[PDB]
């Protein structure tokens, strides 16, 4: 019966709530209240990259920390050298509503997607030296929001149809599909060992997924509106989420509950992107009021501002050696801070 | 050296190509088409066009007096539209199609218009409004079986204005109903506030020929206002 199932769900949620309540013997703030603050943190722009004709929706650094890829709503995908500001490649697309990028960890492939519900895969190292489309992955029923390589032959995607999928490139068909969300899936993040990943999905919840066997292990709540960005702490045992209610939060995978909140009274606008630092001591977030804020991740205090853009900040990233930070926004410019 | 100069040469060739493509990008006008199930946006497409399953978006191209228009129509998505609409904030205009003869779903269209007018990322974009299927409305009004004031009680006291300019020979009842229905939209287009964007309403039928010319004229006015706000004359 429907009513008995609803009652049982309520009882199970009550038991889960009490079990989580038994574990809150302290808080992050009472313990870390004897740590010296990092101090004022100040950064300035070393490079400005010009050439896109419209908004910028995505970027992603290479694993050597020198090359990067970016996508615009002109209909182009550009690959840049960032020590000299030379252009290495400029690839034109079949559809101009592109919304994501990824760069393979080997350096041989790039991928993109958007409002055409298809994931396109481009080979960079061919015998003639030409970039031509290698693959077109089809089967979703809503726009593609994010995608990330695991290796040269496997990839993971999230769409606006409430699912996630794992694809095998050579054969061309899905191998596993992950279901359970109710609304659009907005962001996606991989674990350092690539055995687990987390998804944030525009219904105020986040989920932890097991790649090989294929079930949802844990579900995290606590926001009050949609979730736009997510990432992993370098340790691998925590993650951070940014919402449309003007708040960032920090969640732990072994205590199974919220751990920290970062918000301020003057900030009443949403969050577009989130990322961490190499040691994990700084958290960087980009906002809809055109600038980025730098937060202390163990004490929740604003310790810096990055302010050089004249429109909505849309993407943000940090290299694998920790040297630079890249930001891009709706005004067509990318900037590199150090 | 012997490599850095080659890198500079390659970057120069890429820049040449981008400078070639900029000219074509900045010379075409882009339009977004919105409608509903009972509206006739498909016949608008099928009339001005000649002039992979699970696909997310369709496009059509046409050209009037040597100006090029690209029109986009969304295909296979879901109902919720508050996330993929944000990526349409740079278009020249939004063409909004309404079915004007049904009386049961006009309030839903009014709510849609209110949401599109007042959104944060769509405040500078003008709307061209097509009130479709005039012949069905005229027949239904002449029938006398369904009353408008069962859905809009204010129609009980409305009277057609003394300064109006009707069509040559139309029965006054049809004129009164048409003027009332158009008023309903221009109110939410004047009470909204601001005053940067404008709405251009037309009445069209199921068999017509002049819609491309109308789009042409409205886009001319939009561009002139933009050029008047770009040269610091306001």
């Amino acid at each position, epitope marked *: 019966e429907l009513d008995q199932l609803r009652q049982e769900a309520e009882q199970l949620k009550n038991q889960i709530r009490d079990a989580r309540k038994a574990c809150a013997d302290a808080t992050l703030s009472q313990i870390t209240n004897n740590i010296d603050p990092v101090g004022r943190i100040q950064m300035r722009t070393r490079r400005t990259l010009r050439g896109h004709l419209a908004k910028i929706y995505a970027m992603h650094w290479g694993t050597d920390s020198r090359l990067l890829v970016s996508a615009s709503q002109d209909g182009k995908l550009i690959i840049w050298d960032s020590y000299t500001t030379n252009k290495v490649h400029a690839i034109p697309l079949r559809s101009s509503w592109v919304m994501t990028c990824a760069y393979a960890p080997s350096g041989n492939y790039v991928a993109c997607g958007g409002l055409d519900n298809i994931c396109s895969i481009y080979n960079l190292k061919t015998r003639e030296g030409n970039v031509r489309v290698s693959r077109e992955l089809a089967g979703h029923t809503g726009y593609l929001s994010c995608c990330r390589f695991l290796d040269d032959n496997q990839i993971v995607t999230s769409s606006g149809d409430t699912t996630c999928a794992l694809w095998d490139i050579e054969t061309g068909q899905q191998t596993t599909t992950f279901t359970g969300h109710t609304g659009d899936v907005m962001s996606l993040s991989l674990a350092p060992d690539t055995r687990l990943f987390v998804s944030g999905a525009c219904d105020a919840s986040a989920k932890l997924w097991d790649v090989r066997e294929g079930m949802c292990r844990q579900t995290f709540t606590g926001h009050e509106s949609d979730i736009n960005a997510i990432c992993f702490f370098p340790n691998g045992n925590a993650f951070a989420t940014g919402s449309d209610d003007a708040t960032c939060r920090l969640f732990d995978l072994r205590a199974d509950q919220e751990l920290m909140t970062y918000s301020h009274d003057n900030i009443i606008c949403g969050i577009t992107s989130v990322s961490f630092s190499k040691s994990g001591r700084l958290l960087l977030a980009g906002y809809d009021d055109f600038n980025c804020n730098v937060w202390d991740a163990l004490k929740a205090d604003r310790a810096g501002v990055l302010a050089g853009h004249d429109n909505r900040v849309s993407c943000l990233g940090v290299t694998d050696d920790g040297m630079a930070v890249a930001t891009g926004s709706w005004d067509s410019f990318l900037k590199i801070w150090n | 050296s012997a490599e850095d100069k080659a890198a500079v040469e390659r970057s120069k060739m890429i820049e040449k190509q981008l400078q070639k493509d900029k000219q074509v990008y900045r010379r075409t006008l882009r339009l977004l088409l919105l409608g509903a199930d009972n509206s006739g946006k498909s016949t608008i497409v099928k009339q001005m066009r000649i002039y992979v399953k699970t696909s997310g978006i369709f496009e059509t191209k046409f050209q009037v007096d040597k100006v090029n228009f690209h029109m986009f129509d969304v295909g296979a998505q879901r109902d919720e539209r508050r996330k993929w609409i944000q990526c349409f904030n740079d278009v020249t205009a939004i063409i909004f199609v309404v079915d004007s003869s049904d009386y049961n779903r006009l*309030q839903e269209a009014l709510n849609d218009f209110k*949401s599109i007018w007042n959104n944060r990322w769509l405040r500078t974009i003008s709307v061209i409004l097509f009130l479709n299927k005039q012949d069905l409305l005229a027949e239904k009004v002449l029938a006398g079986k369904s009353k408008i004031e069962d859905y809009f009680p204010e129609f009980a006291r409305y009277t057609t204005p003394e300064d109006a300019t009707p069509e040559p020979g139309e029965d006054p009842r049809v004129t009164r109903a048409k003027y009332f229905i158009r008023k309903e939209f221009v109110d939410i287009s004047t009470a909204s506030g601001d005053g940067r964007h404008i709405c251009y309403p037309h009445f069209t039928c199921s068999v017509d020929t002049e819609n491309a010319r109308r789009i042409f004229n409205d886009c001319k006015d939009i561009i002139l206002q933009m050029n008047l706000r770009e040269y610091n004359l306001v």
Partner: nanobody
Amino acid sequence: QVQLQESGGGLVQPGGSLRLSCAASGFTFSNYKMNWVRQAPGKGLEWVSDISQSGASISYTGSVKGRFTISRDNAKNTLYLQMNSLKPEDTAVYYCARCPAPFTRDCFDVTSTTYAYRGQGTQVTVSS
């Protein structure tokens, strides 16, 4: 956990009166604009009325003006609807809906595709 619980409902004879109420939990109630929607047998979701952040602006649909009234109580986080002079065409299920984001003035929330911030509903029958 965004939760919205409706109360009220039942069966009345034509011309009767009812009061529906909704209690909200899991967000800051006073930052949001609120709506009432309903669904009828054989129909889809229809929009009934809405109220603003403080109560200064109120709006109704053309078929209920003069009969239905809407109100907030921000100290108790409750939303109220008073229904008078009920007609047989008012038998339906009623839901309370919340806007997606705070501090805004537009809505996207009659979708059948499982809008997330909405309650389960309550039954209103007007027959004799």
